Amino acid sequence: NSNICEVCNKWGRLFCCDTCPRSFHEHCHIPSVEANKNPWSCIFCRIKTIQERCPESQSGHQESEVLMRQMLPEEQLKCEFLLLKVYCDSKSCFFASEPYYNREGSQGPQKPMWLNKVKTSLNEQMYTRVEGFVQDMRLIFHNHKEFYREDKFTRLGIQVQDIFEKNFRNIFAIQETS
Template sequence: MYVFADGDKNGVETDPQKDDPNEDWCAVCMDGGEVVVCCDKCPKVFHQMCHIPKLAAIPDENETWQCLLCTNLKEIIDAPPTSPVESRGQGLCSKDQKVAERLLLELYCQYEPSLHFREIVGPEVKEYYSVIKKPMALDVVRRKLDPVDPEHYSTIREFIADIRLIFRNAYIFNPKESQVFQDAKSLEEFFDSLLEKWLPAYAYDVEAGSDDDSLDNQPHRKYRRILSE
């Protein structure tokens, strides 16, 4: 495991002539500044606070460290149910917590398509709030995944519903030909492909209803609606 910043690895200047298997930029924020931690199983690097879950401490340079993207999620999913992680109330079991963290990290690592959906639209965009009544963003989902957050998810269904809400809001507010709409569609298709592998019961499998006016602008495809009205 390497920890480095701005061309420096383990306190030693790197040789530009040598092949470096690791990427230059944090996989989440695409910034190379400050200290980044290199995964020992893939080329990705992460800032301590960018990785999901955030790293409690920078690993020792002699430790072997792998990012959550390299974790064998099937082993986690196939494991027996576990008790909820420590939180202020009833929360996700450890297995669901890990699956949700993996799904969210995968979305963040789709850097360009996810950029529009990381932060809540600012209140100064009054037109947005006249149309969208329940704003949602990846950063909010990440906060609610923290076991100590007062709004920590109680079920994996709640987590997936918030992710769906991000895409639904994008479809409602943005024209179909817009880049935001297309990025939402691409990112949701990617999200569904992950659900098919790890949580198939929550992947798309039902035709989107046309009786709800707020859904008219959504792309024509099949998916499982778990949003609460």
């Protein structure tokens, strides 16, 4: 197994996957690494199994159909993975914890949003459909763009949103288009 966490790329107290060489800090993995369970399979392994059990799940989908899906176990897992993929980028640090807004010439967003809040929401089963999760994720970056206006710091929102959107299209097998 790897000697660094797959998400944050640091060493420390790591839990190793039994079916692939990835390792995780307890609260870097999503969901948090489970108490017992030997063997234990990580979220990358669990997602791969879904695809392997239903190869047709990789055919193209319309985003509008994906968003209306109810958050049954497999969609819940897919959203957890997609959130994890965003935390894997080091630029996620900017969006992880609760933000605050005091900048000359800007007003804060009406509905602040951040990754740790989406993480809690997922953990507490607060989303009933994929759309709930996706809307909160996209709101993070939209609030950032709106607040930072012409500051070049706006680009961090663009960059992390691109990571999100690529991974959304991959995980939920959205039909490729130009």
